[PDB]
Homo-oligomer: A and B are copies of this chain.
Amino acid sequence: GELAQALKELAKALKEQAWALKELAQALK
């Protein structure tokens, strides 16, 4: 229903999370 873009906005968050992690990993070298 409208728990449907619940999951959509969470999927975006998870993606932002991944980009952020990648940047930190790269800083740790």
Residues of A within 8 A of B (CB): 1-29
Contacts and interface: CB of A to CB of B under 8 A. Distances in A.
A16 B6 CA distance: 14
A27 B11 CA distance: 23
Contacts of A17: 13-15, 17-18, 20-21
5 contacts: A1-B2, A3-B3, A11-B12, A11-B13, A16-B21
Contacts of A8: 6, 9-10
B13 A6 contact: no
Contact of A20 (B5, B7, B9, B28): B28
Nearest to A1: B3
